Amino acid sequence: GIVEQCCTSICSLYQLENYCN
Amino acid sequence: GIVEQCCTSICSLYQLENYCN
Amino acid sequence: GIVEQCCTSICSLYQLENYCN
Amino acid sequence: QHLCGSHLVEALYLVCGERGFFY
Amino acid sequence: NQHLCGSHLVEALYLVCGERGFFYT
Amino acid sequence: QHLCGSHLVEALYLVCGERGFFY
Amino acid sequence: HLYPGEVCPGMDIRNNLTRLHELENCSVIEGHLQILLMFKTRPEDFRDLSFPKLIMITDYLLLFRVYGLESLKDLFPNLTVIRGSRLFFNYALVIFEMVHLKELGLYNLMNITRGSVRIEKNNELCYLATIDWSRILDSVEDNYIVLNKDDNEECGDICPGTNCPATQFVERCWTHSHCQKVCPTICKSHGCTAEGLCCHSECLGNCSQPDDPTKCVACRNFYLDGRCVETCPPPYYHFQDWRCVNFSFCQDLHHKCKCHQYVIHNNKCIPECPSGYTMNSSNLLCTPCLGPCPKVCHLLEGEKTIDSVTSAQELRGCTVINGSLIINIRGGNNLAAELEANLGLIEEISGYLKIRRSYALVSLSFFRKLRLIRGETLEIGNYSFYALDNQNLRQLWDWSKHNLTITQGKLFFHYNPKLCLSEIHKMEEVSGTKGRQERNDIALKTNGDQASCENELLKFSYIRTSFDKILLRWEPYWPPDFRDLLGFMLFYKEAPYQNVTEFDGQDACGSNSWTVVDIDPPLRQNHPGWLMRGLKPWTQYAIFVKTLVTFSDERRTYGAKSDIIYVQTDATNPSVPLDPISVSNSSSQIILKWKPPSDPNGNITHYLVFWERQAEDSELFELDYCYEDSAGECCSCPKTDSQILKELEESSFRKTFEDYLHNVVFVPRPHRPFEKVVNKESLVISGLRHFTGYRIELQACNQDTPEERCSVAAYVSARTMPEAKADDIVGPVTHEIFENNVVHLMWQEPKEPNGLIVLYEVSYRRYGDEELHLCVSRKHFALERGCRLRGLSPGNYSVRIRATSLAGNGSWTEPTYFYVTD
Amino acid sequence: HLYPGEVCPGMDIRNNLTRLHELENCSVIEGHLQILLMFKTRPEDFRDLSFPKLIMITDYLLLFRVYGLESLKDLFPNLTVIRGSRLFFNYALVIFEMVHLKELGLYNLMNITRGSVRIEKNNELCYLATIDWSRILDSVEDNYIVLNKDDNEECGDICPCPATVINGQFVERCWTHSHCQKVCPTICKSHGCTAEGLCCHSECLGNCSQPDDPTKCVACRNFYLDGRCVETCPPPYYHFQDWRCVNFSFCQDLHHKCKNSRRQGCHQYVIHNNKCIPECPSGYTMNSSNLLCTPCLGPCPKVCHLLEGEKTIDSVTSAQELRGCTVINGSLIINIRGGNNLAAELEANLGLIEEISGYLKIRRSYALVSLSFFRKLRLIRGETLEIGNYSFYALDNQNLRQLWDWSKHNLTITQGKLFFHYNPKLCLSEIHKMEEVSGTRQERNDIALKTNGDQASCENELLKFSYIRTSFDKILLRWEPYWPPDFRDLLGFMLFYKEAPYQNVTEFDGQDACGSNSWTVVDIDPPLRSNDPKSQNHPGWLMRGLKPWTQYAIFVKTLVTFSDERRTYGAKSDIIYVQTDATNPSVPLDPISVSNSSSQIILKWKPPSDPNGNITHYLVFWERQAEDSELFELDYCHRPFEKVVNKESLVISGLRHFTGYRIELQACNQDERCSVAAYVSARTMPEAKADDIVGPVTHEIFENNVVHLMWQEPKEPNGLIVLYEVSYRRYGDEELHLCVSRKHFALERGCRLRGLSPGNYSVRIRATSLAGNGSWTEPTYFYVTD
Secondary structure, three states: HHHHHHHHOOOOOOHHHHHOO | HHHHHOOOOOHHHHHHOOOOO | OOOHHHHHOOOOOOOOOOOOO | OOOOHHHEEEEEEEEOOOOOOOO | OOOOOOHHHHHHHHHHHOOOOOOOO | OOOOOOHHHHHHHHOOOOOOOOO | OOOOOOOOOOOOEEEOOHHHHHHHEEEEEOOOEOOOOOOOOHHHHHOOOOOOOOOOEOEEEEOEOOOOOEOOOOOOOOOOOOOOOOOEEOHHHHOOOOOOOEOOOOOOOEEOOOOOOOEEOOOOOOOOOOOOOOOOOOOOOOOOOOOOOOOOOOOOOOOOOOOOOOOOOOOEEEEEEEEOOOOOOOOOOHHHHHHOOEEEOOOOOOOOOOOOOHOOOEEOOOOOOOEOOOOOOOOOOOOOOOEEEEEHHHHHHHHOOOOOOOOEOEEEEEEOOOOOEEOOOOOEEEEEEEOOOOOOOOHHHHEEEOOHHHHHHHOOOEEEEEOOOOOOOOOOOOOOHHHHHHHOOOOEOOOEEEEOOOOOOOOOOOOOOOEEEEEOEEEEEOOEEEOOOOOOOOOOOOOOOOOOOOOOOOEEEEEOOOOHHHHHHHHHHHHHOOOOOOOEOOOOOOOOOOOOOOOOOOOOOOEEEOOOEEEEEEOOOOOOOOEEEEEEEEEEEOOOOOOOOHHHHHOOOOOOOOOEEEEEEEOOOOOOEEEOOOOOOEEEEEEEEEEEEOOOOOOOOOEOOOOOEEEEEEOOOOOOOOOOOEEEEOOEEEEEEEEOOOOOOOOOOOOOOOOOEEEEOOHHHOOOOOOOOOOOOOOOOOHHHHHHHHHHHHHHHHHHHHHHHHHHHHHOOOOOOEEEEEEEEEEEEOOOOOOOOOEOEEEEEEEOOOOEOOOOOOOOOOOOOOOOHHHHHHHEEEEEEEEOEEEEEEEEOOOOOOOEEEEEEEEEEOOOOOOEEEEHHHHHHOOOOOEOOOOOEEEEEEEEEEEEEEOOOOOOOOOEEEOOOO | OOOOOOOEEEEEOOOOOOOHHOOOOOOEEEOOEHHHHHHOOOOOOOOOOOOOOOOEOOOOOEEEOEEEOOOOOOOOOOOOEOOOOOOOOOOEEEEEOOOOOOOOOOOOOOEEEOEEEOOOEOOOOOOOOOOOOOHHOOOOOOEEOOOOOOOOOOOOOOOOOOHHHHHOOOOOOOOOOOOOOOOOOOOOOOOOOOOOOOOOOOOOOOOOOOOOOOOOOOOOOOEEEEEEEHHHHHHEEEEEEEOOEEOOHHHHHHHHHHOOHHHHHOOOOOOOOEEEEOOOOOOOEEEEOOOEEEEEEEEEEEEEEEHHEEEEEEEEEHOOOOOOOOOOEEEEEOHHHHHHOOOHHHHHHHHEEEEOOOEEEOOEEOOOOOHHHHHHHHEOOOOOOOOEEEEEEEEOOOOOOOOOOOOOOOEEEOOOOEEEEEOOOOOHHHHHHHHHHHHOOOOOOOOOOOHEEOOOOOOEEEEEEEEEEEEOOOOOEEOOOOOOOOOOOOEEEEEEEEEEEEEEEOOOOOOOOOOOOOOOOEEOOOOOOOOOOOOOOOEEEEEEOOOOOEEEEEEEEEEEEEOOOOOOOOOOOEEEEEEOOOOOOOEEEEEEEEEEEEEEEEEEEEEEOEEEEOEEEEEEEEEOOOOOOOOOOOOOOOOOEEEEEEOOOEEEEOOOOOOOEEEEEEEEEEEEEEOOOOOOEEOOOOOOOOOOOOOOOOOOOOOHHHHHHHOOOOOOEOOOOEEEEEEEEEEEOOOOOOOEHHHHHHHHHHHEEEOOOEEEEEEEEEEEEOOOOOEOOOEEEEEOOO
């Protein structure tokens, strides 16, 4: 679940790193 | 008569329903 | 081929860049 | 508009096929 | 803009994280 | 019309030449 | 007697006979007299009914299918004139195809003021050939004489006489009891007494008393003060070319009708001003006004549901139309030009407005003249406007070249999916309908929605124009997501006037003059743009782009509209000077005529013209006789929106697939004599050698000052007029009579060879005998310094000599006489 | 035999690459296969790993973000058959983010048993024209293949490997140049084939070690057991999937393990039809003490709870989730963003549902025009409702045109409003059926009827052309009218006519006129009278302006108001191909006539412009125009005809030399209706020999040197002789001639010379006709005394 934020809004760097750890 | 009707203007079915008696 | 893309159906804006230096 | 004179008479004869003829 | 989902989103995210070892779903 | 020969020469000239016209 | 009875106007009699009794008292049947719709009236219904007063028919007497009557003796036996004031198909009398009308009943009417008579397909009308048609009209015009029951002799005509005054047709008569009062054939349209007695011009039709205006049975020119006045005093307006009516009369008619409230032109009372004139509210005068001018023009049935060219063609001859309008236009490919020709000059409407079932429209720029709706005919809810069923209504009028301030009525915008509410906002703001606090029924559920009027615009950041190819690269457009942009659509067309656009195009379906180009979008880094593949040099073109972006059911749009630029293609070498026509108007003058280049590529500064002497040939002296396919863009290739729908569906499919995948993947923390011709297409080349060909070069030079950018040579060989005046043999034929009678002929070569001389003709003749002719070849001519008269005969010889040039033979020389003795 | 290594499941491959070791033992990937996050992968890092395994994969495969691997031979050439029991977004084949694969290397997969192919994001790929999809596709799903280098100008797929091509094209089918296309018998490859190119045992799919040997196969399309590809297995071997059976111990062991709460995600395996399955289907439940599927108290299906009280289905991947459901505990939203071929799977997988707790919304209908998978669905609980109290929402339905039958499928809406906007492919009759069948209550809701049924023509009533009349451009039809509940609710009838070459033209769906590529519309006003056969016997219209001899497909359609009632549907008529009456065959064009001899003339022309009916004949007449006689004496000193029937050329012979001939040409389509005589002219070839002087040159030799010459006039002068060229010659002199005029010729019966020089004299006489002209008489002599 990444797209529902990065195009809805500007994804926070923490949100991006959530999917990597 | 019809000379003033169709030679001058356009005649129609509803109009002619009372004609050709 | 350049002629294939241009002489047979016109080329695009970014097409001739390939055939140009 | 273009049904005039004898052409007008022909038109009157032919158009009313659901009725008789009176011109 | 910055509403990135697709090529830009992926190129940004990979450099952002995962080089550290991506989370396994 | 398509870009052929002279037309192609001119088209490439319009594209390349800004960095060196190469056919 | 000047119309002693009642003046009763025209009427269309149908299924009735009562008004005929009024005709008895009537002297003037004003206007026409139509007898029609006799589908239940029989001949017995009509009997002989006389009118001891009837004198006029101001208009034509129309008879149509009158199954009633047995003859014209039944109706109208007393009548004086069929006024030619108004006609019918240029016939002042029309009697068309009526059964049960056999005889006639009149003897006094021998005139029609003007016009003709349409005797067409009479069924029983007898006594027609018995009367001549040249004694009733001023002139014969459109007159039918065929199709009668007497020219065809389809009736038994009994003529009581030609009283019965003296002058196929037996005699001049109208019935087995009515003869014709034939009068001198000078009272054609002025009429004569019913005794065969013609009279003056003032009296019309009949004249018991021939002269004076107060004794005329009917008047010819005008009626006033009880006499046939020749001209009406200005207070009494010339009415229908037959009488004089007071100004109070015309004002009363004007007020009664308001019906074409009567006006006055040249002191002549008329219902409305003549075309080419306009209203003058001083004496209701008609002052000239060319073209359709603002007049009271009540639309037929108070409106005009326009869906065809004819419905829109009724606006001509009028500018301020009265009545509402229902805009039912549908179809038509690039045809609104005729509309604006018919409506662009219109600027005022009395009633409301209806736009029902109008779909072949895009933008509204058709009325830059209309600025106020009178709204006399007010729709329900006090509406002077009603727009609906406009499936394609993209935009409305501007507020710079078009103004509008509505005084009454509301605005209605329903079923207008292509109509964005911003245009409606502009309409209401400038018009003031909403400013009037009027609840304008605007279906926002149909207006604005399902329409994308976006603010994004593009501009060509990079431009590179040539004579045929124009290279462009505009600014990249990036909606919130890089995937949102779905390419760009360019639109280009010629720019004669820098005021046209696609919304100024056909604004409908079919082949539009504007051309469309599509460009691959950049990547989010390149400048989107396009290089033209080819254009006509020296021509201006309006070019703009409108991009494509992602759209969803939520009506999410980001469309960018690049601005329109009017750029002209660069010039090049001018085309060839068309049609070199070099003709010699003299032996030294040659007139060259041609046409300018097809492609001027700038003003044609001058023309280059040469000529080379094409003289006579040398051997003539010796002649002695003694694959293709459509390339690039297509103008007849349409693009279906279904492709756009499928493309959007496919792109959405792919993007959904991608998002599906991404969300599944991750979870957060767990040379020659010549002349130059300047701006001319004809020129006489005076001073050239006679009978000389001239291969004339022809070039067109659109540039002379910086360079001679001249067209290619156009070679035409023009030969000057040959001169044969100099082929006459010069000098008497001196006879070198030798011992053997060999006459070495001493005749000299003419003054000029006229081109060249091929031989010499010597008609030497034995005197008083058969003549002889001798051909003298040029070689033999030089060998014998003329020729040799061999094998002669005793006696005199008549010797005439004529040279033979190539420009024409000269003249036979004097017959030189030498007498061979014995 | 068929599967040497372990039957491994499918997993995700990200970051590290150690796990590939296990794949060296996985001959069968039972499940999906997914690889992702390959950024540290060089085209040299894959030379280290390859497998003799992955002979078969039961589900889809996923490609994502990988580098290197220029070809496919760097791994197993295996996976002859893929079951594809699970698809990712309807795709058993996904290709994405590939920037190094230059060609193809595998040569075993000949059967795409299940799933679609998604090929994209390639800028270096080649060898994609050697697929021969016909031989590869045993199932097609409109595979998406774009964004590839072979799509662009990439290569020609050259190999030393012409292989087999059953397509119109012919490609040297070879995934790699080295190995050709895997060829199997075109008559037996689904019944198992062999790498040897021989038909295999009919218990196997694709390649086999030996022909007709179930033991020596490669993939089991039916079942595998005891080192042999089979179709049957003993009860202990319970049928697991459709490629093998599994031992009982497996079944009870997994039943016991899934029974333990530490892993409840897996279901306790039970025996059903001697097949070990995870759980029991609808109507049945788990039998822990029986390892079977016993009715609880009869039927007991899956009460499928929808998360957030709603389920959204967009792909077969999503459709497979809730199969076997009968009870639905939420609302629904459906959207078709492109893609088609979906209803069959809906009917086969999710028709079992019969009730829905929540509402339903539909947007962007793009792959369905009808619904039949739900006949049992009869009740909507309305537990979850949309804003505006909607139990349903209809929007963007640009493809759907039928909802369901009304007897087989009933409906009961417990609660909730209904939304119906922008559904032009669905008409008002279907909306009425929703309202009545569903009883929806029956409260009217805000519905944009103006946006629904726009393209859905559902004029249930009919119109019929009662009166017929036509004269060559004027077809007057007074059809049988349609009367709505009110003659004023009626808004008219639209006439639709169009020229038709043959009877295949049909009616249109309906739109407003803006172009020139649809039916011609003529609207007739609604008769607002109470059916008086004195003011309107039969409503109709006389259309004109056509041309003679042309067929026109024609029909009419009623215009009706928007009655809130389920009534006022409108009426329409049928396509009548009316052929216009034929008149005036028109004039033959461009008459041509050229003479090729004295008695030979070639004539040509063109067919008439408007041949009405059929051109029956051509009226052709002509007449010889002899040379004019006024020049005959001057000294310079009925009509023949032919019949043509459907022809455009003619040859005329037997004519005299020279002289004029003018020919008229007029066609006649009826025998009658003729045309204008197209006039052309020609002149035969003059005979210069017929112009030759007859009669010799007589010499009345007298002592006085008076010679009288008599000769006759040419036999057939082209016209007549204007004068004679009498060239009497003194021997040894220049041109000597006598211009014998007609007057002189008549005067001296030719000519008379009086006086000559001593010695013989020769004379030649030549006539001068209008054309051709005479010829010189032979030189004849007469000696003058010396």
